[PDB]
């Protein structure tokens, strides 16, 4: 029998244990599942338009605070009066402002120029960031159609054009569709066809980070397999510069002097940031690039503070500690906190005490305290995400950035503990035994304090193999306009001339799987990085040299026509067989199908010239009984290659003997049947 | 142990079963936990307060 009570209850035990080993990893993946950040998008103060451009504004210590924008038609004269209490005046004489938020590409999306004119600059800079963060991740933005993909956008209600009551001259029905943050997450999920939760978050200076929290949750629950979190604060009006000045909180210089004694206000800046969030298991299983990992995010409120605007200390300590508890980590684990650093000599004191309480109380090494707003300015709903791009660039470059205007440490903060070192110099922050962790803090004017934990991506990417191949994979690119077609080859040429040594097959794979098929396509098969950057230098001007150019809107499925006679040369397929394994296998199969009925094996025939037969007193491929099998063999092998490279037929046309290939490749007859 | 051939592994199975119960109830108190509508307040049209 079964060795009574020793081979069953021990057999039932391994399943009450392993199911438990499986029902707990479910709780740990339902609550502490580390979500990956697949890709980065940012339009930040200054010249920053891409996540790699933000690093040489952040690593060499450049402040983005330059001045108020002039593109927007701002008054700029009633904004500044000597009387500080004059209604309609602003106190800050600058700030980091976007120089490209005024412009947009209407024809690129399904957007009319009039509708795009009615679109909020936040909502027009968010669609472009979504497209960028999808194209950065190797995920075709048109491939996510009717798929679960949440959109979580942090926003600030900003006055744009005329009163909705007064309507407009051209913007009558689209003015709501711009000046409502409602569609500021639904528009993105509509143009890209995303089906997951399109949620707009509004908690002011913490929105984006609160947003990513929600996105993180939507990943740790399984509602959406992917999320696009982040936040935008683009200012089309000086309105809150006028209004933040009335409470006397803006820094006259517009600079966020975070944790500095020379601070005279919290400053202001406009920006936008976007994170492509996916759970680590899904991110690595699908092959999506993992930059860093959001492990735990907490969102809390300041409670009954000293007013709605004043921050709270205990609530900040509670949210920073809750983020660590939900991430399963502790104070020491975080190697570099990048807290709000509002910029004022009131918020910074309170928040540094909270940092010293949640972190500095129990520290093994000095926590590297930083603030992105020092380099950029207070980006509000773009703050909470901008710090996340900072840290992710910090771990993808292995350096802890400076905090500008922080040489004079604040006298109102007790730094005598030494557990917190303000990042006034670039501290080397290399990969080591400890998983490199850090934490982003954002405390909004609404009182909602939020904190996220960013660990370095587990370094399991290492282990890739190397090889070489003769397959010249096409370098395919596409844009929505002819000028954009000439600009997607110039920027790629600039990238391959400024980032040299990137192997051509990697470039072809990234250009092919990761770029949407748009209705202006340029494609060339490179042989060298000098014969490709030359084509990319002719495609930038419009000259189609060594490439193929085409406008092909409303065209997705191809027909396979089969010509009959005409290539009497027949000295072609030798190279294809000698260089393509598929042509070296399908040809063998169809020949061995032809041999039982026609003894001629196409293999000796293949290795020859066009005048080979002429030497033996015979015209180029003239013997019908010997020629028809070889066209059939080469033809079916060519069709098999074309179907092996992803091109499948829609209809089939056979001129004279292409009917046999119609029998073979379309499944009507087998290789043996059609060969016979 | 002494009687038949199970006085130990039978307890390990019992606790393991109880834990699995207590960890599977955690899943259903984390994703499907009913959320009671403790109260409702409204200012809707028609003088409704």
């Amino acid at each position: 029998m079964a060795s009574t009570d020793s081979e069953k209850v021990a057999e039932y035990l391994r399943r009450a244990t392993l199911d438990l080993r499986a029902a707990r990893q479910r709780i740990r993946e339902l609550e502490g599942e580390p979500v990956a950040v697949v890709a980065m998008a940012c339009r930040l103060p200054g010249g920053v338009s891409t996540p790699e451009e933000f690093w040489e504004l952040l690593s060499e210590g450049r402040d983005a605070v330059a001045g108020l924008p002039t593109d927007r038609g701002w008054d700029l004269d009633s904004l500044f009066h000597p009387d500080p209490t004059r209604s309609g005046t602003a106190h800050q004489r600058g700030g980091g402002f976007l120089t490209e938020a005024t412009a947009f590409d209407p024809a690129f999306f399904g957007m009319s120029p009039r509708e795009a004119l009615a679109v909020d600059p936040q909502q027009r800079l968010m669609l472009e960031l979504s497209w960028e963060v999808l194209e950065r991740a190797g995920i075709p933005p048109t491939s996510l159609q009717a798929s679960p993909t949440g959109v979580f956008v942090g926003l600030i209600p900003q006055e744009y054009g005329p009163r909705l009551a007064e309507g407009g001259e051209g913007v009558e029905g689209y003015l709501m569709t711009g000046t409502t943050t409602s569609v500021a997450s639904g528009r993105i999920a509509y143009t890209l066809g995303l089906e997951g939760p399109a949620i707009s978050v509004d908690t002011a200076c913490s929105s984006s980070l609160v947003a990513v929290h929600l996105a993180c949750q939507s990943l740790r629950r399984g509602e959406s397999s992917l999320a696009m979190a982040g936040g935008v604060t683009v200012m089309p009006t000086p309105g809150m510069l006028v209004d933040f000045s009335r409470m006397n909180s803006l820094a006259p210089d517009g600079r966020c002097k975070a944790f500095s004694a020379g601070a005279n206000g919290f400053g202001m800046a406009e920006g936008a940031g976007m994170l492509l969030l996916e759970r680590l298991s899904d991110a690595r299983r699908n092959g999506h690039p993992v930059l860093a990992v959001l492990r735990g995010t907490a969102v809390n409120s300041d409670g009954a503070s000293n007013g709605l605007s004043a921050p709270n200390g205990r609530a900040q300590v509670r949210v920073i500690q809750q983020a660590l508890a939900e991430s399963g980590l502790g104070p020491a684990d975080i190697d570099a906190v990048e807290a709000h650093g509002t910029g004022t000599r009131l918020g910074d004191p309170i928040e540094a005490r909270a940092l010293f309480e949640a972190y500095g109380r129990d520290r093994e090494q000095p926590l590297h305290l930083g603030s992105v707003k020092s380099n950029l300015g207070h980006t509000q709903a773009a703050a909470g995400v901008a710090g996340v791009i900072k840290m992710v660039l910090a771990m993808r470059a292995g350096t802890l950035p400076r905090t500008l205007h922080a040489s004079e440490r604040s006298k109102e903060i007790d730094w005598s503990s030494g557990a917190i070192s303000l990042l006034d110099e670039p501290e080397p922050w290399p990969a080591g035994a400890r998983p490199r962790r850090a934490g982003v803090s954002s405390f909004g004017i609404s009182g909602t304090n939020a904190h996220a934990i960013i660990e370095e991506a587990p370094q399991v990417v290492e282990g890739e193999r190397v090889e070489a191949g003769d397959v010249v994979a096409p370098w395919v690119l596409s844009a929505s306009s002819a000028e954009g077609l000439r600009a997607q080859a110039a920027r790629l040429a600039a990238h391959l001339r400024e980032h040299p040594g990137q192997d051509p097959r990697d470039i072809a794979y990234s250009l092919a799987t990761g770029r949407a098929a748009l209705p202006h396509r340029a494609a060339f098969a490179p042989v060298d990085e000098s014969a490709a950057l030359r084509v990319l230098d002719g495609l930038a001007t419009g000259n189609a040299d060594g490439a193929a150019v085409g406008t092909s809107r409303a065209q997705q499925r191809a027909v396979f026509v089969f010509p009959g006679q005409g290539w009497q040369w027949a000295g072609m397929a030798v190279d294809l067989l000698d260089t393509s394994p598929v042509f070296a296998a399908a040809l063998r199969e169809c020949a061995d199908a032809l041999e039982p009925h026609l003894d001629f094996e196409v293999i000796p025939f293949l290795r020859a010239e066009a005048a080979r037969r002429e030497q033996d007193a015979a015209l180029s491929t003239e013997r019908v009984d010997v020629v028809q099998p070889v066209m059939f063999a080469v033809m079916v092998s060519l069709a098999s290659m074309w179907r092996a490279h992803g091109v499948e037929p829609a209809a089939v046309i056979g001129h004279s003997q292409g009917e046999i290939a119609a029998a073979c490749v379309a499944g009507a007859l087998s290789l043996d049947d059609a060969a016979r | 142990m002494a009687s038949t051939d199970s006085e130990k592994v039978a307890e390990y199975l019992r606790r393991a079963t109880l834990d699995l119960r207590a960890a599977r109830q955690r899943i259903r108190e984390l994703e499907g936990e009913p959320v009671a509508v403790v109260a409702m307040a409204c200012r809707l049209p028609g003088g409704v307060s």
Partner: antibody
Framework: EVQLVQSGGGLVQPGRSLRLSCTAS????????MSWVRQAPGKGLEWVGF??????????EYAASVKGRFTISRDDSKSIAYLQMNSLKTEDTAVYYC?????????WGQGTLVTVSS | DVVMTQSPLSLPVTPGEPASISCRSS???????????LDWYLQKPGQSPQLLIY???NRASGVPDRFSGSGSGTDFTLKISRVEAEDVGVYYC??????????FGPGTKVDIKR
């Protein structure tokens, strides 16, 4: 994950020998007791046999009908379980299943359709 | 002797309905451990069987919650809270008191009800 990939199909006549190989991937092979269960066409399961775990003696227990002929063996080093089918009669024309437990048949593998016809 | 078991061989189910499949055993499957030693199994149409429930009531990992098990030492009942196309097939009632296991029994033939 866990898989119980199977092999050993083919053609046999009444009075021949056959091999059913089960490869387990995902967990330690030595502490599970292998079992072979059969699917007669038209009905559900009937259990063929079970070998004890390596540390539980590794002794075998088959059904009276297939006692001896249907030998059950296993091995950890290459992690493989053998059902050697001997003198397959025409009542052995069935879908055999590699089960992951002497009393707890968990994964059931895939199922090999063994045919015994003249 | 042997614990020979019976079940509702031809129990019908319909989409959107909770179903109650049962098993009856001659002897008592409740061991001195206090744990019922019954197993519920599901065979899909033309696929490998799967282990739904062990020890009378508890799940196997990966088996949806839509199956629940209960019952006394003799009578055992599995309720499907919500039947679907994946909850169709053959349900096997397995005793773990005596193993030799000659056959799996008649099995409950489950079909979508019209």
């Amino acid at each position: 994950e866990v898989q119980l990939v199977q092999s050993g199909g083919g053609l046999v006549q009444p009075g021949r020998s056959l091999r059913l190989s089960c490869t387990a991937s995902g967990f330690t092979f030595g502490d599970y007791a292998m079992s072979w269960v059969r699917q007669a066409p038209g009905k559900g399961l009937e259990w063929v046999g079970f070998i004890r775990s390596k540390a539980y003696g590794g002794t075998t227990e088959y059904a009276a009908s297939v006692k001896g002929r249907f030998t059950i063996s296993r091995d950890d080093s290459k992690s493989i379980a053998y059902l050697q089918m001997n003198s397959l009669k025409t009542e052995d024309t069935a879908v055999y299943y590699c089960t992951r437990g002497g009393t707890l048949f968990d994964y059931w593998g895939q199922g090999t359709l063994v045919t015994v016809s003249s | 002797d042997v614990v020979m078991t019976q079940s509702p061989l031809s129990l019908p189910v319909t989409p959107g309905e909770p179903a109650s499949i049962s098993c009856r055993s001659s002897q008592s499957l409740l061991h001195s451990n206090g744990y019922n030693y019954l197993d519920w199994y599901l065979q899909k149409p033309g696929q490998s069987p799967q282990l739904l429930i062990y020890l009378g009531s508890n799940r196997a990992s990966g088996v949806p919650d839509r199956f629940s098990g209960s019952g006394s030492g003799t009578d055992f009942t599995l309720k499907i809270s919500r039947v679907e196309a994946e909850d169709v097939g053959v349900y096997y009632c397995m005793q773990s008191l005596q193993t030799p296991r000659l056959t799996f029994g008649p099995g409950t033939k489950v079909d979508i009800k019209r």
